Design a protein around this motif. Structure first.
Motif, mmCIF file in Angstrom:
data_model
loop_
_atom_site.group_PDB
_atom_site.id
_atom_site.type_symbol
_atom_site.label_atom_id
_atom_site.label_comp_id
_atom_site.label_asym_id
_atom_site.label_seq_id
_atom_site.Cartn_x
_atom_site.Cartn_y
_atom_site.Cartn_z
ATOM 1 N N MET A 303 0.971 -1.449 0.548
ATOM 2 C CA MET A 303 0.070 -0.097 0.000
ATOM 3 C C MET A 303 1.005 1.628 -0.104
ATOM 4 O O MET A 303 0.715 2.433 -0.559
ATOM 5 C CB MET A 303 -0.791 0.132 1.167
ATOM 6 C CG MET A 303 -2.246 -1.520 1.226
ATOM 7 S SD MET A 303 -3.179 -0.672 -0.225
ATOM 8 C CE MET A 303 -3.927 1.063 0.305
ATOM 9 N N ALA A 305 4.365 1.591 -1.532
ATOM 10 C CA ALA A 305 4.182 0.965 -2.480
ATOM 11 C C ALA A 305 3.226 1.244 -3.862
ATOM 12 O O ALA A 305 3.780 1.345 -4.886
ATOM 13 C CB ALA A 305 4.933 -0.063 -2.629
ATOM 14 N N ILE A 306 2.160 1.940 -3.260
ATOM 15 C CA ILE A 306 1.453 2.248 -4.017
ATOM 16 C C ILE A 306 1.159 3.762 -3.729
ATOM 17 O O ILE A 306 1.419 4.445 -4.710
ATOM 18 C CB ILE A 306 -0.057 1.760 -3.957
ATOM 19 C CG1 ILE A 306 -0.628 0.490 -4.031
ATOM 20 C CG2 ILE A 306 -1.474 2.408 -4.048
ATOM 21 C CD1 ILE A 306 -1.881 -0.358 -3.799
ATOM 22 N N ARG A 307 1.225 4.547 -2.747
ATOM 23 C CA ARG A 307 1.192 5.380 -2.433
ATOM 24 C C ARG A 307 2.673 6.380 -3.100
ATOM 25 O O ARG A 307 1.772 7.058 -3.681
ATOM 26 C CB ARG A 307 1.015 5.109 -0.820
ATOM 27 C CG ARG A 307 0.364 5.480 -0.120
ATOM 28 C CD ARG A 307 0.752 5.417 1.469
ATOM 29 N NE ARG A 307 -0.293 5.255 2.367
ATOM 30 C CZ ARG A 307 -1.427 5.831 2.978
ATOM 31 N NH1 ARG A 307 -0.675 6.900 2.237
ATOM 32 N NH2 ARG A 307 -2.415 5.335 3.492
#
Ligand code: AGS
Ligand code: AGS
Ligand code: AGS
Lengths: 342, 327, 350, 217
Positions: A303, A305-307
């Protein structure tokens, strides 16, 4: 009106009320029916049917004027039932290797030494610990076969319907060789014979008797192994604690530290991280946790690493992931915020 | 009288139509039963099918035959419950600023809807007149909204909280059909069908009102600790308490409940109101009644002040008890 | 002609006709029909109507006397679908940034960004969040943020109240679950919103059957439908409450609902903005200091601020004054909170 | 309800509801409440209407089951005895001694004392002395299953009470069915709630001409 004329010929051909079967007498058909709502009844059949297949846990055709038995079928059916990392817990897969693999490899150590083959295991451990993984990790070597069955899937509102699915699972088991049905939540399936003058949760009762019958005794198992999962050996039956059925009791609990490093390996390799980071610091940050929560940690580092647009996870991604889960999502954020320690 | 063989076939019941559809059919859902689609008769129209208006279904072939008015009928079952035409202003004496609050919340929507609707929103809807039960709250609210004479029809709305509410009530909005067809009236209530009825209140009184807010009122006791899903400030606008009435109010209610009696000249009521500790409304009436009882046991027609003081000794002592002042 | 075939189909029908709920295919066109009360002969079907419009176990048109299946049911316009199927993308995404800003970002990069760009899970092998319980104190913004994502969207939004599923008929609520998830299935990628399902657990009714054996079955149909089988894929569902005590943990567990999101009643640094914006569209004697009101109530929601900032203007415009005195704010706040008891304790830190 | 001239709607004790053509025999205003009416077995039409119904499950013992106790037959209850006389029998005849002084009619009363003071004995004697229609019930049957059941019992007593007379009607129970603890979701809370709300909401403060002195003890 594609068949309208024949529909004006089926008006003299109409029979068979639903009428689920309770039980029977002996020496004769002499069955016993509740319809739905009214009352109960001690019934007998019409002559041109099969008195064999009017067995208990079924709903038969029934006349209006004579309530005589007409043809059944199963009118309650089909929507009723919903490994490279072999190595999780350590001392467990070896006892798994024993109780599963050693009867399924050789009747040499067992029959010649004068013991019976150990065929069943009582797993016990907290949830989120890998009962599912070890269960299915059996199924690399057998042939490929596995079926998964939660216990409360059988909570269906007709008598012997769960017993009918016990019939179904044991007559799917013998179709195939070296197969694995899995059991879980075996408390609602029933181990204790709680009774007083109520007559309530009895489909569980007769389903559990059907379970003892088809499980062990009366043509035993062969190339079928089934694990049973729980938090307790406390709410079981002494008839499957009949000492030759479920006799191993493989133990495990929360992993040590190095188990969590291995699960860090597992849920690091199967997603997009960078191969320059360590995990033992994160293993220190998880004193009590589960590998399911290690999945939550890895998906939360995902998450982050999505941000930011990250496909190469830094150490800081998992740092802030663990900091998220164990200290900023354990309840809110503010069990820390004092020094006194460092 | 020879026609009365027409009686001898058909108790042709009241039908429950949700709505009609095309092809000369309707949807009748009979009174404790289920959906049965049928054809209609010739003396009423598919056009005549009003949305959720009852009909007269003959049960020959369930011929949809006639359509019946009055539109719900648990209705007059509640409309034959209100029926309390009580008394007048002069026996109130003391909650007078609360009477001006009752003016503000009730009488101005009675007199002028568009002097609050000129402001741009709807009106308030309740005061939640909590306190010790029976200070004359019945007398207060019923009297001051009795003299409006046509705008307060006190339903009491909760006397069978388990049988008016949900056991015959559709979604108790028979009450709201009353509130709309008796657009000058007021709804009075007490205390999860109560919670469902709260949610249909919130379907209506959250700014979606025909006849202006009507005036839904509940007043509770013992501590205002019912379930707090009712207690948001956008569910009941105003909230008014009832204090223990003071020396002025005890004096005024003392003149009220002493006036009608056979009076002795040479009395001092303020003394008796000074002796009272501020009880909740009408221990005035308790002292008056027990002084009348002392006059009853004895034989008099003049009711002097010492008789009232003996009644004070009856219904004012306990609370008593000193060597306890400390504090 | 067609008229005689149609008349013969109409006279296969017998004008008192009925409706019953089914279970299961009996593949060779003879069937068997429960009613509401379930009296079930081996019935036929009038073979010009389509039997295979429908999946197993749903209402059809029946007869009273030979009970036979006649026609497909009408697509019955219950009062739910008009509310369930959200008609327009309404309004109010953000008139005023500065209310939460913490879980605005969270609801964004957990609901929009997985859905509106479903190509990040390609890179990193992550599953989307299926259900997130947004919850907290009453009057925070949960319904507001639901409408905010409902307008700021590219998915067909759906909005469900938890008391919509509570009807007195037998099996009615499970059928409403069935048609509800048909609505949730057959639009688009969709954002379902569910509200008030903490008002369903310690709840019993009088327009009702056997209470604990009624919506146990309905919520169990919700269980078996929501995150059971019938493959999840990309269907966004958000459920919201105020309290968590009446929640069965069988739905709280993972698989079904992943993320758990509270909402703090805000700090004074944002109370100044929420009090300002609630007072942004009125006339007010600007000498008065809201910082009294801002510092006073220690666990204020925004419905508190709503009722205060409107009711003070109501107390001023009650006697037709455009601008508000500070003691009208006193009257407003002491109406709004029953016994405004936040002074000592404390009060006397100090 | 009635739709039109001489044709109306009746629910029944058969379960369902019906719409019936009614005769000109019954006078056109005798059908205001849900009154006790008579229908036909087969063909369902009104014949007659009976305005009262619903006796209170024993209905006042009707003859003799006053335990035959006098005033001085009671050993020593002189304040309770004497004041009950003052607030029961002296009001029953002298309505006007409450008018020339201008006081009030009566309502219930409260007693207390240790177990064994002859607690029912006063009720026995005052039932014996009076002339009125002494409808009695007891308390602990109020705790019952269905919705508003005991509340329906209280309203049966009150409607039958206002049907008979403001004569004298009686209940003897206070304890443990109507304690002051309103605030506990601890078992039978539907029943506890309906009993408490029924007691207060049928108390009403007053009904003013009915049911003289429910004595609680
Ligand atoms: N000892 C372990 N070794 C490796 N992975 C693990 C271990 N414990 C947990 N995990 C991981 O965490 C998951 C735990 O969730 P599941 O096993 O799927 O469900 P479960 O809760 O373990 O099933 P139960 O409750 O034990 S029957 C596993 O599937 C792995 O991904
Ligand atoms: N643009 C906005 N940004 C942040 N907060 C806002 C905004 N607009 C309104 N609010 C606040 O959000 C609150 C929304 O109230 P709701 O959450 O609907 O209250 P609620 O409906 O009682 O919640 P429940 O009890 O769970 S149904 C309002 O009271 C406002 O103070
Ligand atoms: N003072 C008394 N002297 C003699 N016998 C008495 C006296 N009081 C009661 N009794 C006897 O007891 C009967 C009535 O007693 P009760 O009035 O029922 O007492 P009680 O009501 O049972 O006490 P409670 O209600 O449990 S507190 C009479 O018929 C007598 O036989």
């Amino acid at each position: 009106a594609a068949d309208k004329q024949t529909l004006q010929s089926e008006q003299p051909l109409q029979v068979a009320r639903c009428t689920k079967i309770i039980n029977a007498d002996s020496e004769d058909p002499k069955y016993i029916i509740n319809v739905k709502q009214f009352a109960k009844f001690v019934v007998d059949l019409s002559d041109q049917v099969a008195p064999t297949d009017i067995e208990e846990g079924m709903r038969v055709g029934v006349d209006r004027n004579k309530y005589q038995i007409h043809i059944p079928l199963p009118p309650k059916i089909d929507p009723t039932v919903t490994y490279s990392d072999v190595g999780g817990c350590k001392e467990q897969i070896e006892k798994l290797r024993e109780v599963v693999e050693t009867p399924l490899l050789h009747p040499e150590r067992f029959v010649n030494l004068g013991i019976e083959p150990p065929k069943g295991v009582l797993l016990f451990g907290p949830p989120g610990t890998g009962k599912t993984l070890c269960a299915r990790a059996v199924a690399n070597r057998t042939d490929a076969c596995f079926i998964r069955v939660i216990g409360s899937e059988l909570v269906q509102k007709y008598v012997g319907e769960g017993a009918r699915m016990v019939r179904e699972l044991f007559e799917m088991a013998r179709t195939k060789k070296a197969c694995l049905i899995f059991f879980d939540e075996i408390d609602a399936i029933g181990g204790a014979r709680f009774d007083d003058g109520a007559g309530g949760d009895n489909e569980v009762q007769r389903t559990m008797l059907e379970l003892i019958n088809q499980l062990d005794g009366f043509d035993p198992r062969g190339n079928i192994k089934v694990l049973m999962a729980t938090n307790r050996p406390d709410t079981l039956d002494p008839a499957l604690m009949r000492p030759g059925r479920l006799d191993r009791k493989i133990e495990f609990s929360l992993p040590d530290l190095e188990g969590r490093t291995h699960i860090f390996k597992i849920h690091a390799r199967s997603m997009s991280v960078e191969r320059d980071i360590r995990f033992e610091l994160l293993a220190r940050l998880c004193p009590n946790s589960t590998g399911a929560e290690i999945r939550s940690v890895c998906t939360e580092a995902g998450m982050f690493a999505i941000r930011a647009r990250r496909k190469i996870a830094t150490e800081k991604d998992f740092l802030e992931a663990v900091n998220k889960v164990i200290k900023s999502y354990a309840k809110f954020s503010a069990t820390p915020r004092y020094m006194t320690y460092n | 009288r020879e026609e009365l063989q027409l009686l001898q076939e058909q108790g042709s019941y009241v039908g429950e139509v949700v709505r009609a559809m095309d092809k000369k059919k309707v949807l009748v859902k009979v009174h404790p039963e289920g959906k049965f689609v049928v054809d209609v008769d010739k003396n009423i129209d598919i056009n005549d099918v009003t949305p959720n208006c009852r009909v007269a279904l003959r049960n020959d072939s369930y011929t949809l035959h006639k359509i019946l008015p009055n539109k719900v009928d648990p209705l007059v079952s509640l409309m034959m419950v209100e029926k309390v035409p009580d008394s007048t202003y002069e026996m109130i004496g003391g909650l007078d600023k609360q009477i001006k609050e009752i003016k503000e919340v009730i009488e101005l929507p009675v007199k002028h809807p568009e002097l609050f609707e000129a402001l741009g929103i709807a009106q308030p809807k309740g005061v939640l007149l909590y306190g010790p039960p029976g200070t004359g709250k019945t007398l207060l609210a019923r009297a001051v909204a009795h003299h409006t004479d046509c705008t307060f029809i006190r339903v009491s709305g909760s006397e069978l909280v388990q049988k008016f509410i949900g056991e015959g009530a559709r979604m108790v909005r028979e009450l709201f059909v009353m509130a709309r067809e008796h657009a000058p009236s007021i709804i009075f209530m007490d205390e999860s069908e109560v919670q469902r009825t709260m949610l249909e209140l919130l379907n209506q009184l959250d700014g979606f009102e025909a006849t202006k807010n009507i005036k839904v009122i509940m007043a509770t006791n013992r501590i205002d600790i019912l379930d707090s899903a009712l207690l948001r400030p956008g569910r009941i606008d105003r909230k008014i308490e009832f204090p223990p009435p003071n020396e002025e109010a005890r004096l005024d209610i003392l003149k009220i409940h002493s006036r009608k009696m056979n009076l002795t000249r040479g009395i001092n009521l303020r003394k008796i109101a000074e002796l009272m500790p501020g009880a909740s409304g009408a221990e005035v009436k308790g002292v008056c009644t027990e002084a009348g009882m002392y006059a009853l046991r004895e034989r008099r027609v003049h009711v002097t002040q010492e008789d009232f003081e003996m009644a004070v000794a009856k219904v004012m002592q306990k609370d008593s008890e000193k060597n306890m002042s400390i504090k | 002609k067609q008229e005689e075939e149609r008349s013969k189909v109409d006279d296969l029908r017998g004008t008192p006709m009925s409706v019953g709920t089914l279970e299961e295919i009996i593949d060779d066109n003879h069937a068997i029909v429960s009613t509401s009360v379930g009296s079930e002969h081996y019935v036929s079907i009038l073979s010009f109507v389509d039997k295979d419009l429908l999946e197993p176990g749903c209402s059809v048109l029946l007869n009273h006397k030979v009970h036979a299946v006649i026609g497909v049911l009408m697509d019955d316009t219950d009062p739910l679908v008009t509310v369930m199927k959200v008609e327009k993308a309404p309004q109010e995404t953000y008139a005023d940034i500065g209310g939460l800003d913490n879980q605005i970002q969270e609801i964004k990069e957990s609901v929009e960004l997985p859905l509106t760009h479903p190509e990040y899970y390609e890179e990193m092998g992550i599953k989307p969040p299926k259900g997130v319980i947004l919850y907290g104190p009453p009057g925070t913004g949960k319904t507001l943020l639901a409408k905010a994502v409902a307008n700021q969207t590219s998915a067909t939004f759906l909005r469900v109240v938890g008391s919509e599923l509570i009807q007195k008929y037998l099996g009615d609520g499970p059928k409403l679950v069935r048609e509800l998830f048909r609505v949730a299935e057959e639009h688009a990628p969709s954002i379902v919103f569910i509200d008030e399902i903490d008002a369903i657990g310690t709840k019993r009714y009088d327009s009702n059957s056997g209470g604990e054996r009624e919506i146990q079955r309905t919520m169990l149909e919700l269980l078996n439908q929501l995150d059971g089988f019938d493959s999840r894929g990309d269907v966004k569902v958000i459920m919201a409450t105020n309290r968590i005590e009446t929640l069965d943990p069988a739905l709280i567990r993972p698989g079904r609902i992943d993320r758990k999101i509270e909402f703090p009643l805000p700090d004074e640094k944002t109370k100044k903005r929420i009090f300002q914006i609630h007072t942004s569209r009125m006339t007010l004697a600007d000498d008065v200091t809201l910082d009294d009101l801002i510092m006073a109530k220690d666990d204020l929601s925004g419905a508190d601020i709503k009722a205060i900032c409107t009711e003070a203007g109501l107390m001023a415009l009650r006697e037709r004054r455009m601008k508000v005195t500070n003691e009208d704010f006193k009257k407003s706040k002491e109406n709004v909170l029953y016994k405004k008891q936040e002074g000592t304790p404390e009060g006397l830190y100090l | 309800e009635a739709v039109d001239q001489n044709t109306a709607i009746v629910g029944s004790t058969t379960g369902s509801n019906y719409y019936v053509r009614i005769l000109s025999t019954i006078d056109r205003e005798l059908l205001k409440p849900n009154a006790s009416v008579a229908l036909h077995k087969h063909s369902n039409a009104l014949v007659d209407v009976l305005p009262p119904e619903a006796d209170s499950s024993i209905m006042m013992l009707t003859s003799d089951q006053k335990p035959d106790v006098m005033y001085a037959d009671i050993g020593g209850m002189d304040i309770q005895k004497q004041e009950v006389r003052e607030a029961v029998e002296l009001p029953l005849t002298h309505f006007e001694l409450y008018k020339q002084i201008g006081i009030d009619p009566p309502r219930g009363v409260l007693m207390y004392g240790p177990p064994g003071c002859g607690k029912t004995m006063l009720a026995k004697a005052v039932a014996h002395h009076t002339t009125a229609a002494f409808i009695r019930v007891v308390g602990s049957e109020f705790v019952q299953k269905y919705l508003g059941e005991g509340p329906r019992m209280v309203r049966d007593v009150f409607r039958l009470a206002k049907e008979n007379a403001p004569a004298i009607i009686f209940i003897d129970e206070i304890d443990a069915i109507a304690t002051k603890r309103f605030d506990a979701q601890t078992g039978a809370d539907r029943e506890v709630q309906r009993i408490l709300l029924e007691l207060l909401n049928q108390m009403d403060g007053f009904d003013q001409n009915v049911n003289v002195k429910v004595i609680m003890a």
